[PDB]
C-alpha cells in the first residue's frame, strides 16, 4: 500500500513497463540540418558540454566508450527526471534494471583490465609507495571491494531514487492529514515539500552523473 508506486505497472493485463522504458529516447529528436530548432540546439549543446566532461579525462582507448558513457548519462538523467511526474513509475527504482546497467558496464570494464593490460591492472591492488610487511591484509580490500563495486552502483542509484520518492510521498501524505487541521501549518509542511522537490530534481541529475562517473572512473583505471 506504501510501495505501490514501485510495483510493475500493468494496464488491461498488458505489461506497460515497456512503453515507459522506451519513452526517454523519444524526447531527444535529431536532425541532419545545420541550423535547427531550439530543442535540438539546446540538446546538442548539453551533449557537447557533457561529453567534454566525462570523456576529456580519458586516453585514446578510453575515448572509444564516448558513445556509451554519454548515451548512459542521457538515459539515466531522463529516466529519473521522468519519475518526478505525478504517479509516474520510474524504472530506476528497480533493482533489476539497475543491476542490468551496472554489471555489464562493470564486468566489461575489468575484463578489458584482465583480458588485456592485466599486468598493469595487477598494480592497482598494491599502491605505489607501499611497504610489504602487511600486504597479505591489503589484498582482501582491493579485491572484495572490486567484487562489490557492481553492487555499489546499482544500489547507490536504487536506494537514492526509491528513498527520494518515499520521502516525497510521505511528506505529501502529511500535508493531506494536516489539511483538515490547522491550515497555517499545512503551508509550512507544504513549503518543506517544495524544497524537497527542488532537491529531488537535483538528485535526479546528480544520481545520473555519479553513476556515469563511477563507470567512467572504473574505465579510466582499466584503459
Amino acid at each position: 500500500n506504501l510501495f505501490a508506486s514501485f510495483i510493475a505497472p500493468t494496464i488491461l493485463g498488458l505489461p506497460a513497463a515497456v512503453l515507459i522504458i522506451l519513452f526517454p529516447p523519444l524526447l531527444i529528436p535529431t536532425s541532419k540540418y545545420l541550423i535547427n530548432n531550439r530543442l535540438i540546439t539546446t540538446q546538442q549543446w548539453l551533449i557537447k558540454l557533457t561529453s567534454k566532461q566525462m570523456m576529456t579525462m580519458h586516453n585514446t582507448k578510453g575515448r572509444t566508450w564516448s558513445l556509451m558513457l554519454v548515451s548512459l548519462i542521457i538515459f539515466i538523467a531522463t529516466t529519473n527526471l521522468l519519475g518526478l511526474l505525478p504517479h509516474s513509475f520510474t524504472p530506476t527504482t528497480q533493482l533489476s534494471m539497475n543491476l542490468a546497467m551496472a554489471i555489464p558496464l562493470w564486468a566489461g570494464t575489468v575484463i578489458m583490465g584482465f583480458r588485456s593490460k592485466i599486468k598493469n591492472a595487477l598494480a592497482h591492488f598494491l599502491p605505489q609507495g607501499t611497504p610489504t610487511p602487511l600486504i597479505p591484509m591489503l589484498v582482501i580490500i582491493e579485491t572484495i571491494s572490486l567484487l562489490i563495486q557492481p553492487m555499489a552502483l546499482a544500489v547507490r542509484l536504487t536506494a537514492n531514487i526509491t528513498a527520494g520518492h518515499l520521502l516525497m510521498h510521505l511528506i505529501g501524505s502529511a500535508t493531506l492529514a494536516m489539511s483538515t487541521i490547522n491550515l497555517p501549518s499545512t503551508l509550512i509542511i507544504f513549503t518543506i515539500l517544495i524544497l524537497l522537490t527542488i532537491l529531488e530534481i537535483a538528485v535526479a541529475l546528480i544520481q545520473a552523473y555519479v553513476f556515469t562517473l563511477l563507470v567512467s572512473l572504473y574505465l579510466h583505471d582499466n584503459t
Binding site: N1, A4, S5, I7, P9, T10, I11, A16, L19, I20, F23, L27, P29, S31, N36, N37, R38, L39, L82, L85, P86, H87, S88, F89
Partner: protein
C-alpha cells in the same frame, strides 16, 4: 482522412498491418513534431504537452491502486 469523414467503413478501410499502424504512429509523430517542436522560436509547450499526456497514462494504470484509498464509500 478523418475529421472530414462520416462512415463506419473507415474503421475497416484502414491498413491494420504490423507495418500499417506503425505508419500511423510515425506519421502521427511527424505531424506533431513538425507542428510544435520543429520550428525556430518554438516554445516549451511542445514538451509540457507530452508530459501532460504522459501523466494521464502514468495515472491510468495507477488507478487500480489508488482506488483502495478513497475517503468515501457512497
Amino acid at each position: 482522412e478523418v475529421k472530414l469523414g462520416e462512415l463506419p467503413s473507415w474503421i475497416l478501410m484502414r491498413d491494420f498491418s504490423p507495418s500499417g499502424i506503425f505508419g500511423a504512429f510515425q506519421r502521427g509523430y511527424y505531424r506533431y513534431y513538425n507542428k510544435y517542436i520543429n520550428v525556430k522560436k518554438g516554445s516549451i509547450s511542445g514538451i509540457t504537452m507530452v508530459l501532460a499526456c504522459y501523466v494521464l497514462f502514468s495515472y491510468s494504470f495507477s488507478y487500480k491502486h489508488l482506488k483502495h484509498e478513497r475517503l468515501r464509500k457512497y
